[PDB]
Amino acid sequence: TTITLYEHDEKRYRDIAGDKKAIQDALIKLNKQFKKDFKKLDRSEDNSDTEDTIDESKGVVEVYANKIKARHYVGFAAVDNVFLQILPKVFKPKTWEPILAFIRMLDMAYGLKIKDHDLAYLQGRNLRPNLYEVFIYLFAKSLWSEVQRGYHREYVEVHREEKFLRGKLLMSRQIRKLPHQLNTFSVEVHELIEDNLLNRIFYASVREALRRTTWGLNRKLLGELMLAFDGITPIHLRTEHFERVHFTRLNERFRRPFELAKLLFMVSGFFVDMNKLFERFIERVLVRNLAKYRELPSSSTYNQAYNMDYVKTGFKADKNFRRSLNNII
Amino acid sequence: GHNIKEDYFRVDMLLNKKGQVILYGPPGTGKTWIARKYVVEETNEKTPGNKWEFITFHQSYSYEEFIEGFRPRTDNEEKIRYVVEDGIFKKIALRALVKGLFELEDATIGKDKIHRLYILLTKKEPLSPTEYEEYLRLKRYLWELVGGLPKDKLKNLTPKFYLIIDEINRGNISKIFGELITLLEKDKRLGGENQLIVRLPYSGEPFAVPPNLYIIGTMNTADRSIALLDVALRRRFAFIEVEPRPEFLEKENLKKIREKKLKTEDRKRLNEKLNELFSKLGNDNYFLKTLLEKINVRITVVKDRDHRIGHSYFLNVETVEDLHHVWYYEVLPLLMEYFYNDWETIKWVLNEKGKEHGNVFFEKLRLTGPNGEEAYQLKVLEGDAFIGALKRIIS
Amino acid sequence: GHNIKEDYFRVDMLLNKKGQVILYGPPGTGKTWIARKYVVEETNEKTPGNKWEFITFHQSYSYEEFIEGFRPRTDNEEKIRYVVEDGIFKKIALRALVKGLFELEDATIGKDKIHRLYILLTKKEPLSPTEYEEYLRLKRYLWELVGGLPKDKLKNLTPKFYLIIDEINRGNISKIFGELITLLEKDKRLGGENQLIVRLPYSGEPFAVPPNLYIIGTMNTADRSIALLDVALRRRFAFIEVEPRPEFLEKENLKKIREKKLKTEDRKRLNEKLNELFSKLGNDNYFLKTLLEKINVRITVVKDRDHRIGHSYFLNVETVEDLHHVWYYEVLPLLMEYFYNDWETIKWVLNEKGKEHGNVFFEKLRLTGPNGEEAYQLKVLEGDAFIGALKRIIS
Amino acid sequence: GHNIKEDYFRVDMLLNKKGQVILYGPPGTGKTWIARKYVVEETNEKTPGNKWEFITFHQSYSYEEFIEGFRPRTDNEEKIRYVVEDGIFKKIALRALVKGLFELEDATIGKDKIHRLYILLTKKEPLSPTEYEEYLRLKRYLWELVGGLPKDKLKNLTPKFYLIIDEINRGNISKIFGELITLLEKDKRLGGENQLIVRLPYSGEPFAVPPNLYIIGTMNTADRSIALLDVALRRRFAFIEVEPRPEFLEKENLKKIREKKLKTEDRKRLNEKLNELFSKLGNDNYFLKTLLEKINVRITVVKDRDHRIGHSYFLNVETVEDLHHVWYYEVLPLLMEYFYNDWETIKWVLNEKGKEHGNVFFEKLRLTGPNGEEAYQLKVLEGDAFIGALKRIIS
Amino acid sequence: GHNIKEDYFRVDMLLNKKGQVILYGPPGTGKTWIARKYVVEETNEKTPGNKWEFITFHQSYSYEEFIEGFRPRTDNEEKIRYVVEDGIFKKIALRALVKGLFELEDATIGKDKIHRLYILLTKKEPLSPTEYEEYLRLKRYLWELVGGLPKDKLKNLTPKFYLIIDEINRGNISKIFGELITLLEKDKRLGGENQLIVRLPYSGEPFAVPPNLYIIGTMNTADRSIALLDVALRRRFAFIEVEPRPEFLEKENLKKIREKKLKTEDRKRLNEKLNELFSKLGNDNYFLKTLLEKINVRITVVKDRDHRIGHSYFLNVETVEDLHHVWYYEVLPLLMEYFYNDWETIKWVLNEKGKEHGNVFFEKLRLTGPNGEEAYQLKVLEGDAFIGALKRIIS
Numbered sequence A: 001t002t003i004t005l006y007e008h009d010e011k012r013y014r015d016i017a018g019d020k021k022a023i024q025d026a027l028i029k030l031n032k033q034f035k036k037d038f039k040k041l042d043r044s045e046d047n048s049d050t051e052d053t054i055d056e057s058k059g060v061v062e063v064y065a066n067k068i069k070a071r072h073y074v075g076f077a078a079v080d081n082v083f084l085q086i087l088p089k090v091f092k093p094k095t096w097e098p099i100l101a102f103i104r105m106l107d108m109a110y111g112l113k114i115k116d117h118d119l120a121y122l123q124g125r126n127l128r129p130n131l132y133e134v135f136i137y138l139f140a141k142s143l144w145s146e147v148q149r150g151y152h153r154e155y156v157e158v159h160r161e162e163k164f165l166r167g168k169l170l171m172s173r174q175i176r177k178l179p180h181q182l183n184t185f186s187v188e189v190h191e192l193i194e195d196n197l198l199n200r201i202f203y204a205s206v207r208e209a210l211r212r213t214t215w216g217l218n219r220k221l222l223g224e225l226m227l228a229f230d231g232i233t234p235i236h237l238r239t240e241h242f243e244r245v246h247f248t249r250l251n252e253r254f255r256r257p258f259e260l261a262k263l264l265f266m267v268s269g270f271f272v273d274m275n276k277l278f279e280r281f282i283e284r285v286l287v288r289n290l291a292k293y294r295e296l297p298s299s300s301t302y303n304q305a306y307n308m309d310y311v312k313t314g315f316k317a318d319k320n321f322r323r324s325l326n327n328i329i
Numbered sequence B, C, D, E: 001g002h003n004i005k006e007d008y009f010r011v012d013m014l015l016n017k018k019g020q021v022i023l024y025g026p027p028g029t030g031k032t033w034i035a036r037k038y039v040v041e042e043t044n045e046k047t048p049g050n051k052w053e054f055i056t057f058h059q060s061y062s063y064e065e066f067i068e069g070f071r072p073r074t075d076n077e078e079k080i081r082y083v084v085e086d087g088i089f090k091k092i093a094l095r096a097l098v099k100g101l102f103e104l105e106d107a108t109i110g111k112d113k114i115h116r117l118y119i120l121l122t123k124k125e126p127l128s129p130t131e132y133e134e135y136l137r138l139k140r141y142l143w144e145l146v147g148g149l150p151k152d153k154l155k156n157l158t159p160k161f162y163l164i165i166d167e168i169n170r171g172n173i174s175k176i177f178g179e180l181i182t183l184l185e186k187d188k189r190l191g192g193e194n195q196l197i198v199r200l201p202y203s204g205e206p207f208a209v210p211p212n213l214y215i216i217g218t219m220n221t222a223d224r225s226i227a228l229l230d231v232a233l234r235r236r237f238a239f240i241e242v243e244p245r246p247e248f249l250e251k252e253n254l255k256k257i258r259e260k261k262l263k264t265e266d267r268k269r270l271n272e273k274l275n276e277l278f279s280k281l282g283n284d285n286y287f288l289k290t291l292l293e294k295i296n297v298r299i300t301v302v303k304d305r306d307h308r309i310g311h312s313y314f315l316n317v318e319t320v321e322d323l324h325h326v327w328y329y330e331v332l333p334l335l336m337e338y339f340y341n342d343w344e345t346i347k348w349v350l351n352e353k354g355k356e357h358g359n360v361f362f363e364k365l366r367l368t369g370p371n372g373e374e375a376y377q378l379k380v381l382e383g384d385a386f387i388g389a390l391k392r393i394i395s
């Protein structure tokens, strides 16, 4: 059951065509999982203090016996056949325009490099509006564009007993061989291997993505990524795995799929507070045109003190702020 | 035999243009069979070794087994020695050049040295150290003669030689084709307009591909991603798509293939079984044609065209239990492999998407997990249940 | 029971169809036992050696152990010499071909140099340097005879030889088989349509796989799935799911399984203990049938079919402390290994989720970590509280 | 012209200014062709071996076969002998240096020892163990000779030597060029402003690159995994971009390229074949020019500029059937590797976006998936339907 | 009792069931001590050499030092001869077979040849070249004798032999055992149902594992667990978890462990050190028991059970300064490598999460980072502050 919510919207269980309890206790195991991961989640005067506040069904959503009221935490959530997404109510209309505004919000504020032509490709594909399947697509398209541009291979120094002399003959190991051991060479080789730790992360991210994706567009994109990572060893994606990748000239072109693979993989789903999503927004806005999130710098749209207009639903919004910058400066 | 003499014609015309072709397509389309039958037709030799060779690339296959490498050999007193053994491409490229230098009626080719080099290239036991040094000496004479020989005679090397590289995408082709990225191109061969003689690292010897050597590769395009080939290496080969041909799976076309190699008293005994098989399929002579076309279009929509099911599995089907074998051991494991056990996608390919717990190929388990997970299980249907489920795919 | 006629027929149908088969399944399903018993029944040889051989694939398994490699040997003056010796596959394939040509009534076959090659191929003692040089001159005579023999005689060579490869998924198939994984195909075999006389790298000897030779792979799938195999192993081999059979663990089925070799005074002694075993289980003869199928169904919805619990652990259970040792040191170590300490999935497989600090197999530790981490302790229940939680699994 | 003189002139100017160039670009743009054409015109030698060498880098090139390394050699008095053998670069650099000291007029230079070292460097046979010690002796004589030579003498070494390294990015270049990252700089060569002489690890011998030696690399830019991203190594080379030139595919430019190898009446045979070809393209002499330039700027937008189709795909067409075989077997399978299962983009490259049926290269399959996904079938056009679908691309 | 007699019963049960066992667990639980003292309890031999052997596996341990391999040897007049020298597994298996047949009463046994072979298998020195010929003569006689004896008399060989392989997971089992890991199965031993007598690759004698030879491995599971072991070890070997037992660290149980290793002149000096150790530790005799078990439960919550602290750290502790030196130089260096740069976990393990300053092992630094990063500082407590910090962990 896919739940599409804005912040502080309430839809009852009778409103969503699903089950009366399977929609409940799925995300109950997520907002308690959000209570477990609450200390690493960043807040900027959001006034939560959830040491025991989120334990009383007050995590990313309110689990009432009648309805589900959403909170300021925006993002997607996939648990136990129940998909949930919470969007900013700034972008709430009077069906794809609110989601891509939320993509381009955390593209230019959270520091990602989400291309606009990849978001323009999803429009007109008559798909269902889904935060998870958009980020599954953006990970899988950026990974498939990179693997097509070149398969990631690393050089590793291997000391092998080889039946053909490849690379550098290890002389002190070959000299100290008894004469019944002279049917192989002790060599040092620097070989282009494909089973890297970066490719093992990308393989286990494509495996976890087909386990939960529902678009045929993403499934076809991830299936050809699955055949690309065929000879790669399957791993389990720990947080220990994602920190052993260090980005140099060899693999910095695989950084855009990696920051998307880290955003999805590490009950799972990304959530940022919209209070601090607006904090990191305007500090990247005030510095190139030259923070309370309630209705009453604040946000201004067709549904919603310097007001910030939103033409980002589909860069001339900051030109209207010059009339506000003429008084502020 | 009208359709075999045009797939021969695609291979024959493009081998004259590019020097080397790749037959690509899904597994089971007859790519290894077309490549082998073209070469036994062109080179009138049923066995590899003289004017053609058969090699299969695998993940562990290397440049050193293909071109040359330092290799531990033994003496005639079986003491170990490290020599540079020529690989299978270099042994047949030198064979194609030296046999091509036989028929050249030139007054500068030392035919006694060239025929002795041919014997050491066609010797199949490993060379004695007293004839390995003769083999290095005659190769040293060969590239001395070839380098001072004009393109008018080097481009007309008459006996064509062939190298079938089966499963060529299963190896790291750029690593295995070390100098062969440059050398295989038709301009870069001997007698070519931009003829290139390379120096090989291990032996230190000159090397070039002769023009009468041809390489037919076969690529199963569902066993390795075709978007992982090198674009520059792709420029060397003509790429011939060998697609599944379910028109071979009609009753008259099944008879026209299986009666080219067996006797007449076995022919109509095979024909009465094919008439017995197709009678149980609703007396539809185009049943296996329609069954393979319907699942391959359904595969092409939700997967690649490269992951289609080939026609060669159903080609030796003459009973219902032969069709029951091919479906449950060549089709259904192959569909589960291609779709990574996505039961909802396979059941749409098998035209049974909103249909479980019945006469289906994938029954749903009645138990659900704690996370709401549903599992599907392959159901073996026999008799009228199997034929009625194959008719559900067509309908 | 009809287990060893139903799995016998499925192997025998697939061995004369594909040429080679892989018995895949979860561990403890009798895959190696089915592979060994079918082969012993098909050869009337209880031990490996002449008509069959048994090997295990590991990650360090090589081409040289399997096909061909240089072995260090001594001299008369005890210096190291290097003999190229035949691996286990080259020995079983040459033994299958020589026994195939010895029974083949033909006039071109010498039948005394062939029978002498059969002695040197079955010789368990290592060959003398005058026998090994004789062994090489007979394999020269053999392969020039097989190359001269037509396809009509090499179609059906009568005695059937078997190579059981235990844990075939552990070995690197590209390094072990090499190029010769393609000779396993039914048409590429020695007498088929597209047959291949390949030359071997070390001794330059002709080699081909006869139709006598059948490969019965055995493969655990809980450690490595079929999708994680080499693509050459998926294409050439047929695959049989050796399913875990809880119907063996019925009280009368458990009696007749152990009585196939037991003392005839020990039948009433098993009827002493197996009747007192199932009396403590609640006089339900289908207890261990229901217990293994309630476990394996709950595995299949939360994981693969590959990770089910096999029936072989419960076969030698005659008392409740034998059932306690099998549950706590074979079954629960398998469940904790499969689920990677995800105890709430293991507790749902035993349907004890939401049930902690009691007579459970996994009690909760009452300490919550600094990041909310929770752990579970493997509680070791004994006696009637062990059955009281084991009865709760099937309820 | 820009290629008749000027692309030659870019190589000659940047090879004297920098000492080594790398010709980079898409496949089939003429990087290997102009590298071979320049060096054959400079050295007046059609074949390598003297005054120029041709090598191709790959993943089994090493430092040990390029500069120097312990390579095992075998004699008759000794079985296994590990010997530091100089690689192909150390052979071509010492050959350039020794030949440069032939024509120097110093009385310090012992001409008999230098001429003897040239024989042992240009020896086609491998070095005898009594000649390898003479070779090690004359090398250590030379490196103390040029160490005491004035740098005004050492920099004008007269006969230029050329190492063409085709596919230079296919090897681990910094691993291959071990000491050469230092030594290949133009003022760090012999007689340079900051002349450097390194110490080599295996032979323990001094080494420097002469100013007499030039490197012409040809690297491919379509593969970004082997992209030359070593910022310090890039400083040593001039990077000449060889772009796809669609203006070669004009009718008046096609004949004057293709008739430079044709002598008397095959030019007339080529002329009326190109007259017949371009009359069937609507009398557009710039048809294939517009076909390449419209496809390549469409490839440049959706994929990189390094994935442009080189003009060598279309440079050998003479009929509309040659264009048809270049399209359907070389160009269109390449675009299907570029835009793999990405049908809306490859239809935009072929200017048929939104045209689902008709005389179109990719016909839409009428079936849609369960999730609404869609596939396109490759339609093989022929005749004016093929030429009319090619006119849709160019306009 | 609970350390020996209860734990030996688990070893006696599984070693007489599986034939080989691996004692696994975290370090310091006594796996090597239990394996040594059990085997001395069974063989009645304190020093190895006759009825048992001790080795440690490592990564340079191989086949030639374990079973057999060629070795150079001066046999006569300093002319070295390459002979097969038996490794420790072949020697302990032949020693178990010979002593099993010396105490057998078949009367076709040649006891004078059998007992002389037992002398040659127990020589502490390398064998004479005269004795090496007799050793090969009697090994030849032994394997004709074993090959003639029935299977049922080879079943119950009387004296049990042992091979303690410490750190069994540290050597690669595929290259150490070779193909002989399958001979360790109960049925595949010398007398079982599927009894296999293999040949050895270098010497060619027969070899089989006798049933009275047992393998006791000890294995650390803190580095890599049972689920990531070699697949040859996980099925051939039985597995006993040697867990940390903090009940040894009770005051009465710390006396009884250490009073056995001392004379009675130094027994009473240790009871006046442990009475004055648990007088500073409050007066609780279960302090170090509760200190280990409160920490070890907290390790299972965050990491796993495999990373628990063994009792052997606190087992030689006689004073508070002994407990202080165990803490700051063994325990906390291990816990800071368990939770590296992870401060709130290790403060939760030490029951001090929240308590930031004073009487803690980790004092909070007074500086908050730019991103809110917070670091701690290892505070060395000496005296009653150290005891009160330890007794905060136990409370």
Ligand SMILES: Nc1nc2c(ncn2[C@@H]2O[C@H](COP(=O)(O)OP(=O)(O)OP(O)(O)=S)[C@@H](O)[C@H]2O)c(=O)[nH]1
Binding pocket: C003, C026, C027, C028, C029, C030, C031, C032, C033, C034, C218, C219, C220, C248, C257, C258, C312, C315, E235
């Ligand atoms: N009588 C009888 N014994 C069986 C049966 N199935 C398994 N066993 C016994 O169980 C033991 C283990 O069976 P085995 O052949 O090793 O299964 P496996 O699938 O190969 O197990 P693994 O190697 O993956 S761990 C064998 O010794 C065999 O005798 C059966 O159906 N009948």
Ligand SMILES: Nc1nc2c(ncn2[C@@H]2O[C@H](COP(=O)(O)OP(=O)(O)OP(O)(O)=S)[C@@H](O)[C@H]2O)c(=O)[nH]1
Binding pocket: B185, B187, B188, B193, B194, B232, B233, B235, D003, D026, D027, D028, D029, D030, D031, D032, D033, D034, D218, D219, D220, D257, D312, D315
């Ligand atoms: N006359 C002429 N021929 C050219 C020109 N460019 C390419 N060719 C022809 O096309 C063929 C391919 O050119 P080539 O040099 O081999 O491409 P490349 O740059 O090396 O492409 P790559 O796949 O190896 S990476 C050459 O043999 C040459 O005959 C050119 O500018 N003038």
Ligand SMILES: Nc1nc2c(ncn2[C@@H]2O[C@H](COP(=O)(O)OP(=O)(O)OP(O)(O)=S)[C@@H](O)[C@H]2O)c(=O)[nH]1
Binding pocket: E003, E026, E027, E028, E029, E030, E031, E032, E033, E034, E218, E219, E220, E248, E257, E312, E315
């Ligand atoms: N009396 C007694 N001493 C023990 C016991 N366990 C460990 N020890 C003592 O502590 C020492 C360490 O035990 P040891 O056997 O080496 O631990 P381990 O399990 O092998 O640790 P590792 O080798 O994996 S690091 C032993 O030498 C022994 O003296 C025990 O249970 N009883």
Ligand SMILES: Nc1nc2c(ncn2[C@@H]2O[C@H](COP(=O)(O)OP(=O)(O)O)[C@@H](O)[C@H]2O)c(=O)[nH]1
Binding pocket: B026, B027, B028, B029, B030, B031, B032, B033, B034, B218, B220, B257, B312, B315, C187, C193, C194
């Ligand atoms: N006679 C005939 N046999 C075919 C044809 N296509 C496939 N086969 C047979 O099918 C079998 C397997 O086909 P194969 O070539 O190995 O499939 P591929 O290599 O994956 O394309 C071979 O033994 C062929 O003999 C065909 O068109 N005609």
Ligand SMILES: [Mg+2]
Binding pocket: B031, B032, B166, B167, B218
């Ligand atoms: Mg094939």
Ligand SMILES: [Mg+2]
Binding pocket: C031, C032, C166, C167, C218
């Ligand atoms: Mg097995």
Ligand SMILES: [Mg+2]
Binding pocket: B182, D031, D032, D033, D166, D167, D218
């Ligand atoms: Mg090139």
Ligand SMILES: [Mg+2]
Binding pocket: E031, E032, E166, E167, E218
């Ligand atoms: Mg130990």
